[PDB]
């Protein structure tokens, strides 16, 4: 909450890359698990398909061809190379984290992607222009002003009631 | 309003790498076609 309020960290593109990478990693994990588990081969006679596998096995346990066809018919593109598939699974979350780290290093120097100057101006010279962006800015100002007093006790911040920004009756 | 230098940044950063990749693919396909005998030399 502190980084959101003071740096507008959600607006930083590197954070967007990081969240894209993390969500894509979770997506890849779930989809690969489901695809492998739902394309198993008939290697037993019991309903429990877990006991039809042995670690010292040479042949493949699931039909790569059938999974490829299924995903190419449903989605439009599908994997056709297990090595590339697993390298992609490795690659996505790691690069997401690296991009997020670059963004945080940028924040450490207060070089934050806080304001869109054009929109800030055009809103300053006309009190009818409004976007969700300006609403986020108002939320940031509110959280900052109401949180600073207790977040930083060493500064001895004292804010009278008439100074704190507040909206209407609420 | 907006910076008039971004235009160049955005457009060049979109076009130059795209043409570089298209070049790589085209030359790969041309070499592949040249390796196999046929109407293409």
């Amino acid at each position: 909450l502190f980084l959101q309020g003071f740096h507008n960290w959600t607006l930083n593109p590197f954070h967007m890359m990081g969240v894209a990478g993390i969500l894509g990693g979770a997506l890849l994990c779930a989809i690969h698990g489901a695809t492998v588990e739902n394309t198993l081969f008939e290697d037993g006679d019991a309903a429990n398909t877990f006991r039809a596998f042995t670690p010292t096995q040479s042949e493949e346990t699931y039909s790569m061809v059938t999974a490829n066809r299924f995903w190419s018919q449903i989605f439009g593109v599908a994997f056709s190379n297990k090595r590339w598939l697993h390298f992609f699974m490795l690659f996505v979350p790691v690069t997401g984290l690296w991009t997020s780290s670059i963004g945080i290093v940028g924040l450490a120097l207060n070089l934050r992607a806080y304001d869109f100057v054009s929109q800030e101006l055009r809103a300053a010279e006309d009190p009818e222009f409004e976007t969700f962006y300006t609403k986020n800015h108002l939320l940031d100002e509110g959280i900052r002003a109401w949180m600073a007093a207790q977040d930083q006790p060493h500064e001895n911040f004292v804010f009278p009631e008439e100074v704190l920004p507040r909206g209407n009756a609420l | 309003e907006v910076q008039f230098g971004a235009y160049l940044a955005v457009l060049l950063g979109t076009f130059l790498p795209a043409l570089f990749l298209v070049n790589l693919f085209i030359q790969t396909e041309a070499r592949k076609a040249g390796k196999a005998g046929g109407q293409d030399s």
Partner: peptide, 29 residues
């Protein structure tokens, strides 16, 4: 005037997506 640039970028991305589905390398066994 930047709305034109944004629209061009979005439509170009959509066209790239279009070409990657109907003009893909056919995987053969």
């Amino acid at each position: 005037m930047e709305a034109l640039v944004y629209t061009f970028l979005l439509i170009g991305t959509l066209m790239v997506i279009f070409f990657a589905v109907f003009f893909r390398e056919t995987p053969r066994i």
